[PDB]
Amino acid sequence: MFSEELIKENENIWRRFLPHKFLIEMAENTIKKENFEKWLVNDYYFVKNALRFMALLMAKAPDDLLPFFAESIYYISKELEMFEKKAQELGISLNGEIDWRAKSYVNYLLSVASLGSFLEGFTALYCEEKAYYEAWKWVRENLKERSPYQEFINHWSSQEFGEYVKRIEKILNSLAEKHGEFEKERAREVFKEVSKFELIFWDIAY
Amino acid sequence: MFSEELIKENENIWRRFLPHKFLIEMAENTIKKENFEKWLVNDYYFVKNALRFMALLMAKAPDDLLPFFAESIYYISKELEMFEKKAQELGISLNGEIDWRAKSYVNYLLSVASLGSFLEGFTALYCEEKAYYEAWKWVRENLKERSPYQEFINHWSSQEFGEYVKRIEKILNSLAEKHGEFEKERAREVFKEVSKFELIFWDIAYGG
Amino acid sequence: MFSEELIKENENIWRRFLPHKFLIEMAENTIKKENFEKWLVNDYYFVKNALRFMALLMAKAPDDLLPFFAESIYYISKELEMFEKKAQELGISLNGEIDWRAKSYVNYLLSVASLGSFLEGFTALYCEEKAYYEAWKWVRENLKERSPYQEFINHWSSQEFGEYVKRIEKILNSLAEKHGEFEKERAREVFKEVSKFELIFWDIAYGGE
Amino acid sequence: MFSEELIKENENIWRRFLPHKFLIEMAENTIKKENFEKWLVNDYYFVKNALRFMALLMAKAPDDLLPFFAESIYYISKELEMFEKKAQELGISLNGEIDWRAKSYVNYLLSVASLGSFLEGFTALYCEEKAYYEAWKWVRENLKERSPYQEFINHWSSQEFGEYVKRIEKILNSLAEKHGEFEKERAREVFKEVSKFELIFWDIAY
Numbered sequence: 007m008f009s010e011e012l013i014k015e016n017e018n019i020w021r022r023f024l025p026h027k028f029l030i031e032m033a034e035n036t037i038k039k040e041n042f043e044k045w046l047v048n049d050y051y052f053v054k055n056a057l058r059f060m061a062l063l064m065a066k067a068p069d070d071l072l073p074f075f076a077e078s079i080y081y082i083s084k085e086l087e088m089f090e091k092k093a094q095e096l097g098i099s100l101n102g103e104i105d106w107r108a109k110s111y112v113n114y115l116l117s118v119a120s121l122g123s124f125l126e127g128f129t130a131l132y133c134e135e136k137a138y139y140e141a142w143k144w145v146r147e148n149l150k151e152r153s154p155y156q157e158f159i160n161h162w163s164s165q166e167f168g169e170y171v172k173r174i175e176k177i178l179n180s181l182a183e184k185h186g187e188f189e190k191e192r193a194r195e196v197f198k199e200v201s202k203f204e205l206i207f208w209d210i211a212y
Numbered sequence: 213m214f215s216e217e218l219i220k221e222n223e224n225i226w227r228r229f230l231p232h233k234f235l236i237e238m239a240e241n242t243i244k245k246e247n248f249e250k251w252l253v254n255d256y257y258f259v260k261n262a263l264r265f266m267a268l269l270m271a272k273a274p275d276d277l278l279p280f281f282a283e284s285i286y287y288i289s290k291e292l293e294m295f296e297k298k299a300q301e302l303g304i305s306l307n308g309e310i311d312w313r314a315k316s317y318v319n320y321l322l323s324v325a326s327l328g329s330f331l332e333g334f335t336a337l338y339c340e341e342k343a344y345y346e347a348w349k350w351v352r353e354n355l356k357e358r359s360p361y362q363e364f365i366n367h368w369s370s371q372e373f374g375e376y377v378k379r380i381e382k383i384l385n386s387l388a389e390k391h392g393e394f395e396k397e398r399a400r401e402v403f404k405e406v407s408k409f410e411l412i413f414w415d416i417a418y419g420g
Numbered sequence: 421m422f423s424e425e426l427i428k429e430n431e432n433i434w435r436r437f438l439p440h441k442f443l444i445e446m447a448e449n450t451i452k453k454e455n456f457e458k459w460l461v462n463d464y465y466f467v468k469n470a471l472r473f474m475a476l477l478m479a480k481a482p483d484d485l486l487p488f489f490a491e492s493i494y495y496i497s498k499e500l501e502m503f504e505k506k507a508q509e510l511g512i513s514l515n516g517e518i519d520w521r522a523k524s525y526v527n528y529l530l531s532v533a534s535l536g537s538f539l540e541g542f543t544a545l546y547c548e549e550k551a552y553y554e555a556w557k558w559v560r561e562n563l564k565e566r567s568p569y570q571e572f573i574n575h576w577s578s579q580e581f582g583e584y585v586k587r588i589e590k591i592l593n594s595l596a597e598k599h600g601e602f603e604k605e606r607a608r609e610v611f612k613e614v615s616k617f618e619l620i621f622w623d624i625a626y627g628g629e
Numbered sequence: 630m631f632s633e634e635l636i637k638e639n640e641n642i643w644r645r646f647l648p649h650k651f652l653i654e655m656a657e658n659t660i661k662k663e664n665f666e667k668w669l670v671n672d673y674y675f676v677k678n679a680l681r682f683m684a685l686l687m688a689k690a691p692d693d694l695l696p697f698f699a700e701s702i703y704y705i706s707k708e709l710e711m712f713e714k715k716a717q718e719l720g721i722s723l724n725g726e727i728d729w730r731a732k733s734y735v736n737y738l739l740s741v742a743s744l745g746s747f748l749e750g751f752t753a754l755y756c757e758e759k760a761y762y763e764a765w766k767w768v769r770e771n772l773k774e775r776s777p778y779q780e781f782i783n784h785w786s787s788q789e790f791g792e793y794v795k796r797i798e799k800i801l802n803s804l805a806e807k808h809g810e811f812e813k814e815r816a817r818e819v820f821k822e823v824s825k826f827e828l829i830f831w832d833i834a835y
């Protein structure tokens with residue numbers, strides 16, 4: 007099972023954001039304002055490009071995955087609304103300055119979808135989604151008080167998002183099955199890289 | 213208004229499918245099961261790739277259009293279920309051999325979305341959606357009795373799809389306004405080429 | 421050996437253009453001016469886009485192939501001048517209407533290069549180059565007398581072009597050996613489809629009948 | 630004239646690398662071997678990808694620009710040999726770890742060629758080439774003694790490279806002329822972005 011494998015050889019990296027400083031704070035609501043606001047504007051920018059990334063994947067996707075991508079893009083597209091509501095909730099501007107670490111991650115994703123194989127691309131989608139599910143699972147299971155950000159915690163840790171993640175995992179495993187060792191390694195490498203980007207992204211807040 | 217200039221200039225091509233023989237038979241219920249089947253199999257293929265085309269445009273689209281694309285692709289994807297459900301009811305396979313004209317049209321849209329400007333791609337989208345809205349509207353306006361294919365007639369001629377087309381139209385006209393002659397002429401040419409594809413597609417039903 | 425496999429399973433289609441009506445006429449010099457002109461205008465369009473197709477592959481290619489693609493694109497781009505020279509000498513225009521079969525072949529290649537795997541793309545490249553190498557080689561070998569289009573016959577049948585084809589073959593075979601059968605089948609399909617396009621392209625010269 | 634306009638709105642960014650600390654050390658022969666080696670490994674990676682960037686542009690290029698792209702890609706590909714021989718001589722490995730700012734500049738370029746318009750992409754080509762032409766031309770106009778890296782200084786400050794830049798500039802100016810103010814400003818933004826990337830790349834060496 008490709009998915010299990012990907013997680014193992016990178017458990018080392020994942021262990022670093024499970025939990026990360028930002029999540030510990032989130033859970034114990036020690037987490038400061040200036041920090042959340044920074045994460046918000048940057049992740050908002052990521053989500054927008056993650057939608058372009060998904061749309062590029064859909065264009066190269068097998069016929070039988072088309073319904074999946076259309077539903078998934080529409081589903082992920084709602085996250086935008088969430089970010090723009092919580093921004094009119096905090097009187098904060100999203101059209102602000104974007105951190106370099108974020109553009110780096112965005113551009114890497116776009117390049118993979120554009121020039122990489124479909125496996126590498128779907129592999130990156132699994133990584134990124136499964137990374138937020140776990141990180142946010144941790145925040146949920148380790149929550150103390152009330153977080154003025156419960157909406158975000160409720161979305162990425164929800165059974166619904168977990169089902170979405172499981173659906174991706176199942177598709178990924180089937181794809182990998184019919185692919186050789188060479189192509190798998192390329193995808194393994196993409197997963198490693200996206201794992202690093204996930205870890206680095208959390209530092210943007212500070 | 214760019215959308216109207218596009219329509220005016222390709223009027224003689226559009227008049228050819230408004231109505232096309234296939235539409236006359238749909239409206240008079242004289243359509244042979246054999247011809248519908250061929251159109252169904254080939255159009256299903258087209259719909260699948262039209263979604264890929266849209267996904268390609270989405271990735272190159274301006275930030276303010278991302279919501280429109282996510283919604284439109286989700287909306288258009290429902291057509292797949294419509295085709296599949298209708299195929300179960302008729303015991304028809306959608307895995308058949310695809311006509312050269314269909315593959316040609318598909319590969320052209322894909323190339324436009326991949327290598328062309330966003331204006332060219334969005335213009336192709338408008339042409340292809342507006343074309344079906346007009347074609348199926350004609351069918352609903354001339355339908356003699358209720359058709360065994362009413363589901364398709366209703367979907368492409370509905371107020372909902374009409375609003376979708378209008379939404380595309382508004383965006384297209386705004387985009388065109390901030391572009392120059394050179395770029396517009398490229399789009400005009402794409403609109404012309406897609407128009408011929410739309411006209412030629414109707415003939416697939418009578419292939420073989 | 422993937423390359424030989426590809427050829428073996430499509431030998432029926434290739435036989436149809438080895439030789440095709442157009443090649444027999446080139447070889448016997450029975451080729452009418454009008455037929456050559458139509459082929460010229462359309463192949464010139466194909467070559468331009470074949471360059472774009474190769475550039476798309478280059479962008480997706482492994483580091484160790486960058487030099488090959490740089491050299492090949494430069495080499496193949498020379499063909500443009502070859503078409504342009506010949507067109508000047510014949511007082512013929514290359515700005516005319518392009519045949520539907522040609523656009524269809526071009527658009528398929530660009531779709532494979534953009535949305536397909538690198539393997540499928542490179543397989544399409546091999547097929548297209550290998551097809552022309554064989555066709556023009558047939559022409560050089562059945563040429564009764566010297567042709568007014570010797571330039572084209574020589575370029576595609578030359579030892580230099582054959583080396584270029586052999587170089588693509590060696591790269592392809594080696595790329596295939598590290599892929600599975602699912603992905604190989606995808607490429608097999610592309611090779612078949614490109615083969616049909618090659619066979620059909622020759623008919624363009626007689627279009628407008 | 631588009632080119633002049635691009636250079637004038639980013640003039641303050643350009644002055645930071647005209648000269649940058651790296652160029653000053655190159656000119657005064659005070660540059661340390663560790664810093665040159667890092668720049669070499671990282672730029673080699675950039676050159677390989679710049680080639681993929683150029684090929685992507687070629688795929689979208691107007692018919693009358695195909696000759697130019699074929700020649701330019703061939704011309705620029707020679708740089709790989711230049712880097713490879715220097716690395717042979719220094720007993721240095723090119724297969725090392727590449728800085729993130731480099732991969733980021735690379736991925737930004739790939740995204741622009743993939744998803745952007747042809748003008749945006751060609752505006753990026755001009756910026757990147759023109760930036761090295763001026764950077765290396767500065768080093769040359771300020772050289773104290775003949776440098777051990779004189780070969781790099783000469784290739785990018787050469788008449789041949791300058792003619793290559795001028796050829797790009799002329800094509801860019803014609804293109805911009807037939808484009809309406811909207812896609813122009815889009816390209817202006819890209820120029821600004823590549824400018825910033827050119828400036829950051831010089832820091833990699835340290």
Ligand SMILES: Cc1ncc(COP(=O)(O)O)c(N)n1
Pocket residue numbers: 672675676679680705708757758760761827830
């Ligand atoms: C960081 C950087 N920016 C620009 C260039 C020049 O481009 P080229 O070697 O591709 O002509 C370069 N070599 N490195």
